[PDB]
Design a protein around this motif. Structure first.
Motif, PDB file in Angstrom:
ATOM      1  N   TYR A 125       0.810  -1.200   0.000  1.00  0.00           N
ATOM      2  CA  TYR A 125       0.000   0.000   0.000  1.00  0.00           C
ATOM      3  C   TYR A 125       0.843   1.248   0.000  1.00  0.00           C
ATOM      4  O   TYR A 125       1.009   1.942   1.003  1.00  0.00           O
ATOM      5  CB  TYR A 125      -1.106  -0.068   1.059  1.00  0.00           C
ATOM      6  CG  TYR A 125      -2.053   1.114   1.125  1.00  0.00           C
ATOM      7  CD1 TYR A 125      -3.407   0.944   0.876  1.00  0.00           C
ATOM      8  CD2 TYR A 125      -1.609   2.384   1.461  1.00  0.00           C
ATOM      9  CE1 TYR A 125      -4.286   2.006   0.944  1.00  0.00           C
ATOM     10  CE2 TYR A 125      -2.478   3.456   1.526  1.00  0.00           C
ATOM     11  CZ  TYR A 125      -3.816   3.261   1.268  1.00  0.00           C
ATOM     12  OH  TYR A 125      -4.683   4.324   1.336  1.00  0.00           O
ATOM     13  N   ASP A 137      -0.127   2.964  -2.753  1.00  0.00           N
ATOM     14  CA  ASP A 137      -1.489   3.433  -3.162  1.00  0.00           C
ATOM     15  C   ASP A 137      -1.830   4.860  -3.651  1.00  0.00           C
ATOM     16  O   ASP A 137      -2.832   4.987  -4.369  1.00  0.00           O
ATOM     17  CB  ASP A 137      -2.544   2.978  -2.154  1.00  0.00           C
ATOM     18  CG  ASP A 137      -3.720   3.923  -2.061  1.00  0.00           C
ATOM     19  OD1 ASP A 137      -4.792   3.597  -2.609  1.00  0.00           O
ATOM     20  OD2 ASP A 137      -3.567   4.997  -1.439  1.00  0.00           O
ATOM     21  N   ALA A 138      -1.074   5.902  -3.261  1.00  0.00           N
ATOM     22  CA  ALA A 138      -1.220   7.261  -3.755  1.00  0.00           C
ATOM     23  C   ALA A 138      -1.259   7.139  -5.253  1.00  0.00           C
ATOM     24  O   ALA A 138      -2.025   7.815  -5.939  1.00  0.00           O
ATOM     25  CB  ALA A 138      -0.014   8.073  -3.336  1.00  0.00           C
ATOM     26  N   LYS A 186      -8.075   7.376 -11.610  1.00  0.00           N
ATOM     27  CA  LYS A 186      -8.642   8.514 -10.907  1.00  0.00           C
ATOM     28  C   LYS A 186      -9.422   9.387 -11.876  1.00  0.00           C
ATOM     29  O   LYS A 186      -9.597   8.988 -13.030  1.00  0.00           O
ATOM     30  CB  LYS A 186      -7.569   9.329 -10.199  1.00  0.00           C
ATOM     31  CG  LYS A 186      -6.703   8.505  -9.292  1.00  0.00           C
ATOM     32  CD  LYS A 186      -7.501   7.719  -8.274  1.00  0.00           C
ATOM     33  CE  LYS A 186      -8.127   8.600  -7.242  1.00  0.00           C
ATOM     34  NZ  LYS A 186      -8.711   7.836  -6.124  1.00  0.00           N
ATOM     35  N   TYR A 187      -9.819  10.592 -11.435  1.00  0.00           N
ATOM     36  CA  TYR A 187     -10.947  11.369 -11.959  1.00  0.00           C
ATOM     37  C   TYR A 187     -10.902  11.564 -13.463  1.00  0.00           C
ATOM     38  O   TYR A 187     -10.046  12.283 -13.975  1.00  0.00           O
ATOM     39  CB  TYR A 187     -10.978  12.750 -11.305  1.00  0.00           C
ATOM     40  CG  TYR A 187     -11.287  12.745  -9.840  1.00  0.00           C
ATOM     41  CD1 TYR A 187     -12.585  12.767  -9.388  1.00  0.00           C
ATOM     42  CD2 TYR A 187     -10.271  12.693  -8.904  1.00  0.00           C
ATOM     43  CE1 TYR A 187     -12.870  12.761  -8.049  1.00  0.00           C
ATOM     44  CE2 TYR A 187     -10.542  12.683  -7.563  1.00  0.00           C
ATOM     45  CZ  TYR A 187     -11.844  12.715  -7.142  1.00  0.00           C
ATOM     46  OH  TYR A 187     -12.112  12.701  -5.802  1.00  0.00           O
ATOM     47  N   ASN A 235     -14.238   6.881 -11.132  1.00  0.00           N
ATOM     48  CA  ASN A 235     -13.202   7.093 -10.138  1.00  0.00           C
ATOM     49  C   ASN A 235     -13.118   5.855  -9.263  1.00  0.00           C
ATOM     50  O   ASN A 235     -14.148   5.330  -8.835  1.00  0.00           O
ATOM     51  CB  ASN A 235     -13.517   8.307  -9.273  1.00  0.00           C
ATOM     52  CG  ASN A 235     -12.394   8.670  -8.345  1.00  0.00           C
ATOM     53  OD1 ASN A 235     -11.297   8.125  -8.423  1.00  0.00           O
ATOM     54  ND2 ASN A 235     -12.671   9.571  -7.420  1.00  0.00           N
ATOM     55  N   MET A 288     -11.463   4.132  -5.725  1.00  0.00           N
ATOM     56  CA  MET A 288     -10.912   4.446  -4.423  1.00  0.00           C
ATOM     57  C   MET A 288     -10.578   3.160  -3.692  1.00  0.00           C
ATOM     58  O   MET A 288     -11.377   2.222  -3.708  1.00  0.00           O
ATOM     59  CB  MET A 288     -11.900   5.253  -3.604  1.00  0.00           C
ATOM     60  CG  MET A 288     -12.133   6.623  -4.149  1.00  0.00           C
ATOM     61  SD  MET A 288     -13.393   7.486  -3.218  1.00  0.00           S
ATOM     62  CE  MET A 288     -12.508   7.699  -1.690  1.00  0.00           C
ATOM     63  N   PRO A 289      -9.419   3.082  -3.048  1.00  0.00           N
ATOM     64  CA  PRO A 289      -9.027   1.845  -2.369  1.00  0.00           C
ATOM     65  C   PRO A 289      -9.882   1.623  -1.138  1.00  0.00           C
ATOM     66  O   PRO A 289     -10.082   2.536  -0.338  1.00  0.00           O
ATOM     67  CB  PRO A 289      -7.574   2.105  -1.984  1.00  0.00           C
ATOM     68  CG  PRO A 289      -7.174   3.258  -2.778  1.00  0.00           C
ATOM     69  CD  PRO A 289      -8.367   4.089  -2.951  1.00  0.00           C
ATOM     70  N   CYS A 290     -10.396   0.404  -0.985  1.00  0.00           N
ATOM     71  CA  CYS A 290     -11.189   0.056   0.180  1.00  0.00           C
ATOM     72  C   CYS A 290     -10.478  -0.936   1.084  1.00  0.00           C
ATOM     73  O   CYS A 290     -11.117  -1.545   1.947  1.00  0.00           O
ATOM     74  CB  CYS A 290     -12.554  -0.484  -0.239  1.00  0.00           C
ATOM     75  SG  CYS A 290     -12.508  -2.066  -1.075  1.00  0.00           S
ATOM     76  N   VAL A 291      -9.176  -1.120   0.907  1.00  0.00           N
ATOM     77  CA  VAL A 291      -8.394  -1.948   1.813  1.00  0.00           C
ATOM     78  C   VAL A 291      -7.297  -1.088   2.412  1.00  0.00           C
ATOM     79  O   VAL A 291      -6.789  -0.163   1.777  1.00  0.00           O
ATOM     80  CB  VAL A 291      -7.817  -3.201   1.121  1.00  0.00           C
ATOM     81  CG1 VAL A 291      -8.929  -4.139   0.737  1.00  0.00           C
ATOM     82  CG2 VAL A 291      -7.067  -2.812  -0.110  1.00  0.00           C
ATOM     83  N   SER A 292      -6.946  -1.380   3.652  1.00  0.00           N
ATOM     84  CA  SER A 292      -5.966  -0.585   4.367  1.00  0.00           C
ATOM     85  C   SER A 292      -4.574  -1.126   4.083  1.00  0.00           C
ATOM     86  O   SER A 292      -4.373  -1.923   3.163  1.00  0.00           O
ATOM     87  CB  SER A 292      -6.257  -0.593   5.859  1.00  0.00           C
ATOM     88  OG  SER A 292      -6.051  -1.887   6.392  1.00  0.00           O
ATOM     89  N   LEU A 293      -3.595  -0.713   4.869  1.00  0.00           N
ATOM     90  CA  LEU A 293      -2.241  -1.205   4.718  1.00  0.00           C
ATOM     91  C   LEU A 293      -2.031  -2.409   5.622  1.00  0.00           C
ATOM     92  O   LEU A 293      -2.417  -2.384   6.793  1.00  0.00           O
ATOM     93  CB  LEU A 293      -1.239  -0.096   5.033  1.00  0.00           C
ATOM     94  CG  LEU A 293       0.213  -0.329   4.646  1.00  0.00           C
ATOM     95  CD1 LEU A 293       0.793   0.960   4.188  1.00  0.00           C
ATOM     96  CD2 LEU A 293       1.032  -0.832   5.809  1.00  0.00           C
TER      97      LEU A 293
END
Lengths: 52, 230, 45
Positions: A3, A5-6, A32-33, A43, A45-50
């Motif tokens: 992650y 991820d940016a 992205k947009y 768009n 967006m990540p739905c998992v954390s690190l």
């Protein structure tokens, strides 16, 4: 997961699903947009954390 | 004319935000009148401070993305629009948030001044994942009432500001939920009196007796046009 | 840069309007209940 991820989700692969050569970690590109065909906004967006 | 006057007798704080308040004693029939009037005024016209302009370094528009964070910049602006600030002296202040390192960015990391009080030390804003990532935003907190949005505040702003300052919508009202009840008063010689149990739910920034006092002054100064002139 | 011939000056600019909701838009549920949102009331009323 690693992650950064940016820019991209970076997934470390478990060994059973992982090839012997090509050590390999999967780097997913998030779109992205941007313009859809009906001028709406597609768009992701990540739905998992690190480390999950 | 055999009327009476009410007072704020007991003010209980159930929590820091959700807090009831009594009113005693009210005359017969006046309970729903004062309760509905104080409800309309206390939901429409209270002053509270909120986030107006957010200034992140190295970020041009709000639809970009940033290095080292989870929430995107629209998510950051929404989580900043939910913020609850309580200034005392000034009416327009500038805060500062600077933080590096892996972990979430709470609202308790803002380098406060003396007269600003951030009343939610667990309000999350960002989720910094890279240890080489940094974020340095400079928030601007005005003070008003009602709802003033970005479109109308696109030309209304007179003070020629420079370009690069993201405009966040202003949700100024710190009251979110209010309910009143007309019970039966426990008066030792009267049975035809009632109490008003207003059950407020604030943003944490407003003091309930101060809110009730301000709403009462608003109602009295509005009715002075009926009292004095005809 | 990489593109075809003929066309000379090729500048594409991507605006992004953010439209909120207003008296006159169209909302609907999943059952066929169409609607044109008429009044945007205050919270109190």
């Amino acid at each position: 997961v690693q992650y950064v991820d940016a820019s991209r989700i970076v997934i470390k692969v478990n060994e059973d699903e992982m090839y012997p050569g090509e050590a390999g970690i999967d780097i997913y590109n998030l779109t992205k947009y941007t313009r859809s065909n009906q001028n709406t906004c597609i768009n992701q967006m990540p739905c998992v954390s690190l480390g999950e | 004319t055999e009327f009476l006057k009410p007072r704020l007798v007991d003010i209980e704080q159930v929590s820091s935000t959700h807090a009831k308040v009594t009113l005693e004693p009210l005359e017969r029939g006046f309970g729903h009148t004062l309760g509905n009037a104080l409800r309309r005024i206390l939901l429409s016209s209270m002053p509270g401070c909120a986030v107006t302009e957010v200034e992140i370094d190295g970020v041009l528009h709000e639809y970009s993305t940033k290095e080292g964070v989870q929430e995107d910049i629209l998510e950051i602006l929404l989580n900043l629009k939910g913020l609850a600030v309580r200034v005392q002296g000034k009416d327009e202040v500038i805060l500062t948030l600077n933080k590096s390192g892996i972990g979430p960015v709470t609202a308790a990391d803002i380098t406060h001044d003396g007269d600003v009080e951030i009343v939610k030390p667990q309000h999350v804003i960002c989720h910094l994942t890279d240890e080489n990532a940094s974020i340095s935003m400079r928030i601007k907190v005005q003070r008003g009432r009602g709802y003033v949005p970005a479109s109308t505040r696109i030309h209304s702003e007179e003070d020629e500001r420079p370009i690069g300052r993201l405009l966040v919508d202003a949700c100024y009202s710190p009251v979110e939920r209010i309910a009143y009840n007309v019970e039966a008063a426990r008066v030792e010689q009267r049975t035809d009196l009632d109490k008003l149990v207003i059950e407020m739910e604030t943003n944490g920034t407003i003091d309930p007796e101060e809110a009730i006092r301000r709403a009462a002054t608003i109602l009295a100064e509005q009715l002075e046009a009926f009292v004095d002139l005809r | 840069d990489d593109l075809a011939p003929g066309v000379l000056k090729i500048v594409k600019v991507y605006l992004a309007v953010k439209r909120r909701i207003q008296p006159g838009d169209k909302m609907a549920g999943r059952h066929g209940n169409k609607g044109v949102i008429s009044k945007i009331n205050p919270i109190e009323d």
